RNA sequence: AGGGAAUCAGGGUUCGAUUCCGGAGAGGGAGCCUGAGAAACGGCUACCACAUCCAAGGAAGGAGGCGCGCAAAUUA
RNA sequence: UUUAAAUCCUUUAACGAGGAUCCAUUGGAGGGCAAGUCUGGUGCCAGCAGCCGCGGUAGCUCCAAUAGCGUAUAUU
């Protein structure tokens, strides 16, 4: 009987194995992973970036804009961005995230952009997800605390595939989140493996991280209204890209690409070793728009 | 779990609402359906079948 | 200016039979 | 973006690879220095095949008919019939159609009336035997995958019909073609129609007297078919298929001359010099035919992006020719490593080629 | 020689023998003489032929350089590139801000046509309108965001699709539109104004891709309706459905209707007034009853393409956009 | 003042949009309406309109040279066999 | 007969929705509407699937991934039609009853 | 040879409680130093094996988590 | 009050109910319908089913278990 019973639950076993084969067209290098921050207008977007990146690489960074690289670990880099109450900006980076970190205020509970952005996620393929919540600090550690923890929970599960983590902050020090959360929630980051998408593998696509107008000048002051080239920069994803091709932006519209180069890496992975940890030299910030040290 | 699909579409008890006669039409009569004109055609056939 | 859920979305209870 | 030409030569593949890719065509100078500067009516019927298998597409004549303007539209199947120009073969037609029938919105089932057999094109024999199981090798594999020939017809009369039928796709299975292997057997076809039986007979002993010392095994099929079958003029020929051990066929065919023109041909002399010229493709060898190498290399480019190989022969003018215009229009080029086989005692030298497919799937292909 | 007169010729894919072998000396001959002859589960294949694809893709062009392996394959994931684009819009540069990202999405083949697409549609369970037939609204694609009128239609079981008025509140329903061509089997959704802040749900539909084509074959129900004058048991008199004796002769033979559901054939043309008919019927009819015949009418949508260009706003009005309105705003 | 290429499109897009707008709040046309009567359409409207319907019955067969030497030849066959 | 049935020990099985064969032929029965085409992936035998109610076909299309069970008894419910023994129990992992109600949405 | 062995306490049958060990090692085998008690849970030399920093000359070293759509007590 | 400090347990002041909408579920079996769609016949019928109709878009009944209740495979 007892073999009866290992081998039906063995055949359960590889029933959850099964789906459909296919080739796998993961790059040997792989691009920084794109990690998305949204949530309500006032939650506390910006404030859980700067602790990520005060986590990983010691340099002083102010006035964030746009896509921000960081080297976090041996084999891993990470592109933070943040998303906005918008709506034409929320269905933008849907198409491109690769990690959504949600943000939760769990005194005021559920809002309307945090539904939102979850049906737009199933509707152009779901990345992965692993919501925080925050605020938890109003509550006196009582009954109330903790059944709020498991209300939120238990609606979030239904939203998501179960057992997607949920991660909770307990309070501010001084403005700034307590070290040791910080770095738990950059662990689990580290530790994620991604599913291929179907459309992000079809399309190559670039998140541009440097723009560059390229005109005479002359022409500009002839007619300041004249068609402009422009060069952008970015990491190639997706897949592979042919020197004549059409791209589209959106917002903007479609264009044909006139000519493509590559360049050496900035924000480059180390020369493999042995070290038991990264010194200053290898935790790099690559942030062109954003303002390293002083200088913007 | 036939039953409980069919529970759920039932969940909604409105149903199709009867159309009237034209008002240009009034002074004819009513508008008759299937259910009235049965009434008409059952009585002709057992009058038929009995001459 | 904080647009909180509904009741419907809150509890999701979609099609589900009435009863007494 | 449309693409400009000029003159009428490769006319079919600028067509086939204009309606595939979505991007217009501008041919210009058809026969411009010639005492007939319009269009050949075999090609206007070739615009016309086009049309009845396509759905929104617009095409642009001059009055002069020195230059055409096409704008492809979407691929739509169903049953069609049409009538072939008897100046070209069947087969002309058929090639085009191998290209498009895997990508269309319905399974094509279509009938053709024409001239089967001909010296110019490639008989429809050869296409049934050769590039039929080439596109099974892709997955183009299905139980109504078939060619059949109703009647025979052979020029000028002509009067032929066949019939045929594909599956549709959604997307073409990488290949790895890169042993020839050994040739086992062949197979041959010998056709006779208006004429006496005893002119297929007479083939027979010719082909067979050279190829019975390289090979035991061959054995040649003879075709007589009756009344209308037969069509409206005269005519014999030959046809030979060799099979290797990996899979793959190669084959050489020859016809009669025409009633109208030239002189008469011994039935001796058609068989042993198309057995002789099976044996020089044989020295050529390679996992394609030589008439297949340009309908391979459009199959290899409509990959799921994946690495293919195929080992084929020397290289053809067309073929040449047909891969500058994949670049022009899908911007692939192929990695090109020659194989020595110096020692080996194969023959002539083979060409690798590889490359790495564009993103292709079928669009037309309904989602129910 | 490949990649570094011949017009007006002959289009044959034969390749012409320029030197034949002689074929008689048995030297020709030995050079042809080698070439001719002297437990696991379906999955665990699918799996093993998958892996060797794998392999084979990555290990092929390694030896080549990365210059050539640009003109071999094109450019490959995790390569840091650099683009220029011409003829982007002024207000693009002096407009730029570096909050809103900035994708540069490839497209695919005849990616930039536009046709006709076929999409199946359910609305949403949380929005609290539905969505009428032949109004502006606005669709998340593939990479773009546009503006269009789409048709509405439910299936039968014959196969006709038929226009509806309004999606239906929780069934699945066909939709219709004129835009750009899209693969199969991709997500979309449905906005129905950007510009401005709702309190309720703004997600308003959502569904999958069908279908690419030039036609769209939809069709519409329309009823002519006549009212008999004189009865005869069976046969009546019907007036009121046509208006010459020209358009009867196209209709004989058609099967007609009461309201009541007697069903009928139109018969004969009448004289005596302009547009009457002879019509008999299953059994005899009443004053009251009126008599339709059912006719379908093909119907056609506007070609209306507007995609949206919110990047190309002043830095202060990104969010609001604006477009078509619908029929209820006007 | 000069116009600039984008607004030069948005022109054109404009004047797109106002001729929709009318179509909407426009009575519909009576193709477009269901249940019309005679009043309500022009006279002879239908004869271009290309509607589809259905038949009732079968029409009647056409008498035709070919059908005459059709139903002569099965005569033939049978006065040959003497199948009366 | 450990390996005897068509699931090979299992109580479920994994296949990829080939076509309807019911919807595709026009029968208006609606219990030949709601055969499905399916083909298992652990051995690649093709079986002749259920839906449970018309109406659920909408959220199923070509080519996609579900999870079929056995149908062991109430096989007479269904009008006239032999065969009855699989039943179409999840696609992409959430339930078919569960999409019907609007309570689940189905991510892609 | 995880398992025991025992012990105390008890009215509505004990979901009781606790202890007691057979040794060995500190990247691997040898040598050596102190103390009442160790051939040391700690220094050193030679040899063997690892790995780190450097201005390239030289210098300093001795355990568990995942692989079940899932890694916070690995803490305070 | 508790505690090294705090939480928890125990006291206890003030708010907190009429559709008390401050709204229990899961499974089984039935009823109700139009100028609606399809299929087959035995003129007016039957099956299947019905949020879709001409125009219009601003919360039926019965049974079983009850914070619990089914399905699939093997089995006794
Ligand atoms: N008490 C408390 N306040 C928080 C917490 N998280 C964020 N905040 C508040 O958030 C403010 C920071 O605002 P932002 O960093 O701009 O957060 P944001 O959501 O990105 O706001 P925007 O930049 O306007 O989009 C701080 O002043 C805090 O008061 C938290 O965990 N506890
Ligand atoms: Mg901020
Ligand atoms: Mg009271």
New binding site residues.
Partial sequence: ?RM??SF?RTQD?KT??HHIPVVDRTPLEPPPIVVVVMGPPKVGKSTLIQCLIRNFTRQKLTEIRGPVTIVSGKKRRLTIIECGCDINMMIDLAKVADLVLMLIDASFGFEMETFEFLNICQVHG?P?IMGVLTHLDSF????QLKKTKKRLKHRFWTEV?????????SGMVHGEYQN??IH??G??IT?????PLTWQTSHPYILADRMEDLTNPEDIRTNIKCDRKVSLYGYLRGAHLKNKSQIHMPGVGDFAVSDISFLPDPCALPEQ????CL?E?EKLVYAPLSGVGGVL | ??????????????????????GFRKHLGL?E???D??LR??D??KK?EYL | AKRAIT?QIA?N?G?????? | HSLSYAGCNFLRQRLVLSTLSGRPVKIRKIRARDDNPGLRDFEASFIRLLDKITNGSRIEINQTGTTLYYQPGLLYGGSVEHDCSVLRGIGYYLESLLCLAPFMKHPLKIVLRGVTNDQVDPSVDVLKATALPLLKQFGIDGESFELKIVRRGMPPGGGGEVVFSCPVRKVLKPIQLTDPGKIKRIRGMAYSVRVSPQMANRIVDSARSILNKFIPDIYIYTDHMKGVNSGKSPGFGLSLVAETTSGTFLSAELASNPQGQGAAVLPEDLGRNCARLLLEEIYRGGCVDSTNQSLALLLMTLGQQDVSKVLLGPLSPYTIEFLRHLKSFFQIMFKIETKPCGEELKGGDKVLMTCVGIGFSNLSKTLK | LIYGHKADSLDCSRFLVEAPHDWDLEEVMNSIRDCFVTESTYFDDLKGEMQKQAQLNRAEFEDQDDEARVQYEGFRPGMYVRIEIENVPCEFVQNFDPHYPIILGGLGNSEGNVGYVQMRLKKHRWYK????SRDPIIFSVGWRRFQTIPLYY?????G?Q?????T????H?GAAFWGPITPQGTGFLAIQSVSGIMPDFRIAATGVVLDLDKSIKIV??L?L?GFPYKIFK?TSFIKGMFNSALEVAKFEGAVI???????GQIKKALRAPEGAFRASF???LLMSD???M?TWYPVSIPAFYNPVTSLLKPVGEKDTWSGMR????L | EVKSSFEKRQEKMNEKIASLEKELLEK?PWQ?????TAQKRPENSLLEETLHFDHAVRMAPVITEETTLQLEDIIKQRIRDQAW | ?LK??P?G????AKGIVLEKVGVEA??????I?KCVRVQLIKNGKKITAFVP???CLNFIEENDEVLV??????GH?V?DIPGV?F?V?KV??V?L?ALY?GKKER?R
């Fill in positions: 009987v009866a019973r039906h076993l959850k194995k779901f992965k006196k550690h009582n009954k595939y179960p057992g997607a983590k949920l991660f909770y902050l040791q959360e738990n929630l662990r689990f530790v994620m493996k991604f599913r070793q042995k070290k038991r010194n030299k | 779990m036939a039953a409980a699909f069919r529970k759920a579409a039932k969940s909604r008890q409105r149903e199709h609402r009867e159309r009237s006669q034209p508008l359906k299937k259910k004109y049965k055609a059952d002709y056939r038929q | 009741y509890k209870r099609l589900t039979p009435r009863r007494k | 309108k539905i969505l009428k439910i299936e039968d079981h014959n006709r038929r226009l509806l008025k309004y239906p509140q929780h069934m329903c519409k129900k009823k309706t069976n209707r009461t309201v009541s559901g007697i069903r299953e059994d005899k009126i008599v339709f059912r619908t029929t209820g705003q | 519909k477009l309406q269901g249940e019309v | 007969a005897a049935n699931f020990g299992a109580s479920h026009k029968q208006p029965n609606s219990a509407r109610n018309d109406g069970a056995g149908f062991g008894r109430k419910a009008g023994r039943k129990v992409a992992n339930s009853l109600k991510p």
